[PDB]
Amino acid sequence: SPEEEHPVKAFGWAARDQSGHLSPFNFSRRATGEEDVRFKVLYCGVCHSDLHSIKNDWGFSMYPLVPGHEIVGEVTEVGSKVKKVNVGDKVGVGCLVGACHSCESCANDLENYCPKMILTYASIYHDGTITYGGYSNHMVANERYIIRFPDNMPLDGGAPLLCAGITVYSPLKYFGLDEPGKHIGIVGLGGLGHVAVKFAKAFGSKVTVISTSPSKKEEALKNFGADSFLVSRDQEQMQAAAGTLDGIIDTVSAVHPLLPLFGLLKSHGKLILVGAPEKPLELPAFSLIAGRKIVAGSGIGGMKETQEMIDFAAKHNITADIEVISTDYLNTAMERLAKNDVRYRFVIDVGNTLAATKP
Amino acid sequence: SPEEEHPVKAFGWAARDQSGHLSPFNFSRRATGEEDVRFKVLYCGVCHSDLHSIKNDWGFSMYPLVPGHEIVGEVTEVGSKVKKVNVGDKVGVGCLVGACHSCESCANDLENYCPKMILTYASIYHDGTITYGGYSNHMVANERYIIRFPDNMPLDGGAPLLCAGITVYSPLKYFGLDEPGKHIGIVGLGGLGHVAVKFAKAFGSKVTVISTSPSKKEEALKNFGADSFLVSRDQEQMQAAAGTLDGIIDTVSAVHPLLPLFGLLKSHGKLILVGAPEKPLELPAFSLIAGRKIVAGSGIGGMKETQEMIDFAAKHNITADIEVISTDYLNTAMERLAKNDVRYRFVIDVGNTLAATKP
């Protein structure tokens, strides 16, 4: 049973089937190994991936499932061989908790592209046990997967950077879209989306937000500093912005038309997909052939870059626009997320509200 | 009318509607300008694009339509300003006959990606008249679009290189798939596909052919030098070749599964689409995200590279494997091409059979 699997008792909220209903769940975590860092969870951002997972949208879900991979907390214990962290330090854990550490990808700081990468939740750890996420009281992870939180970085506002942040920061850098002056488009002004605008602006790029929500126009332009706001619903407005973007970061969580997006790209432009739709997208061959355009994918980021990303965010005072919620509000929050009703990221105040939900 | 539009009478075969039925057609071409090169058409390869066009598969077809853009012939007249071409020289014309010549793309020898590029047929020329292709008695084109044919290359066997050849040569070079030690896959062993294998091997790469025709195995391995032949519908064979390719050149002219192709690619692999299916392809976001893979498109090539391509082909004794046909066999040939019944490129013997079809 989950409660007896490991020596240290743990408590959190989990889903038991694809209805995705979350409720109190008792389990356990391994003892602190020599290279392990144990910490009390203070905050955990809510990623749409969490929603996809509890609902089994991708079909890769095993239950019971404890989601959450934008975890921030305070160190309570460290193994005898830990070097970069001390008890009391503020740390975080993203989407990864392990990898093989013996392949070219891992050697090149790309644990995220390791064929044996281990996800923070819904995966199998090196000890053969299921991984449980951040919607819980405490966490333990190997030092290589521990992110050191900057002193000038709010614990709640910076939590989403652990997944949303690195996921958009990584491709902007890798695909050479972080050049000042370049025109970058962001599709879907949601969790990853609004954070992507912030990073793009910090890199000095001109940003165009492509959205299905006219109500987000003022916030996109006046608060996030987007240079242009396009409603994908408006074919008229889209055509007027034809061939204006050097690259696009698409964060849409559902199947959506790609044709219009390629139209916004300049010759040789790049469309980067980071959203994880449940089903395949439509790709018009002509959209790529005419202008030698590219469509690529990107997943989170390696551990080294994740730390570099949070260090950059702290220097540029970048944080997510969050709505802090109590643990018992999780099911309502999940429905609001499904209905595009959050501006722009939910963050669970685990440290102050989880304990009270114990039956 | 086509016959009165220009001063020089011309004769060829054209389609009048989406049925694609080809028959004798009288038209005309402009007088030889100061920078123009006029030549008698000796051969014209039959590209599947010709088939797509006459059947109006893409919807951009204007009728009457004279296809053909793998044109080879002998110069009969040259303008006073022509610098490198002389009467009697063997020359060729590919998919392009013009561009703006005042933009960045043109300046970078990429007339093919110029927004005002002018296709050899079914386009509008600088004088506002419709362009007619190589299924005709003679051709006239500005010197910048004239390819100088190498002395050691057959006029018929080399004709297909003008479109099929440059189209596969360009991406191999551009996406860095032209190096020994690289394992490349070619999807669809047809007109473009078989020439692609030849160039790939000439570059020194290891080549895997992915086909739906098992009868093509022997020719692929024995004649073209492919190192591996995979039947795309054989899941077991495809599975065993998982993650072995650095890149893939997809020439398929119809909708086909991309998921299996992504499976063959190594991490960070590139899938290059050159085939032009009318309907959209299915693109699973996870196929790109898991491994940071790319799908790109490529169209023919610029004039500078087209000349470099044919020179490279001549140096390596590369030619298309053709079936020479008489002009009056065109409708039967189009039916066979539609049914994937040619090994591997039809080439019209215009110089010896076109005139005979004049009533």
Ligand SMILES: NC(=O)c1ccc[n+]([C@@H]2O[C@H](COP(=O)([O-])OP(=O)(O)OC[C@H]3O[C@@H](n4cnc5c(N)ncnc54)[C@H](OP(=O)(O)O)[C@@H]3O)[C@@H](O)[C@H]2O)c1
């Ligand atoms: N690959 C990776 O590494 C990675 C990492 C984290 C998350 N993801 C994935 O990225 C996606 C977004 O996550 P979030 O956490 O950013 O989600 P979110 O907060 O729900 O934001 C998605 C944003 O997209 C738009 N959208 C939703 N449904 C749409 C539809 N049917 N058509 C067009 N636009 C639609 C909305 O923006 P508008 O109101 O502006 O239209 C919505 O605000 C999820 O699929 C998630 O699993 C991938």
Ligand SMILES: NC(=O)c1ccc[n+]([C@@H]2O[C@H](COP(=O)([O-])OP(=O)(O)OC[C@H]3O[C@@H](n4cnc5c(N)ncnc54)[C@H](OP(=O)(O)O)[C@@H]3O)[C@@H](O)[C@H]2O)c1
């Ligand atoms: N973008 C550009 O610059 C450019 C330039 C020239 C041509 N093209 C386009 O490239 C495509 C190929 O032209 P070709 O002239 O090379 O054509 P082709 O000679 O007909 O060859 C297409 C080859 O693909 C495969 N194929 C056909 N139907 C298929 C199906 N339903 N499923 C899977 N494979 C299929 C067959 O190979 P197997 O027998 O091995 O399966 C066929 O031999 C056309 O769409 C053409 O318009 C693009």
Ligand SMILES: [Zn+2]
């Ligand atoms: Zn996430």
Ligand SMILES: [Zn+2]
């Ligand atoms: Zn590894």
Ligand SMILES: [Zn+2]
């Ligand atoms: Zn062609």
Ligand SMILES: [Zn+2]
């Ligand atoms: Zn131009």
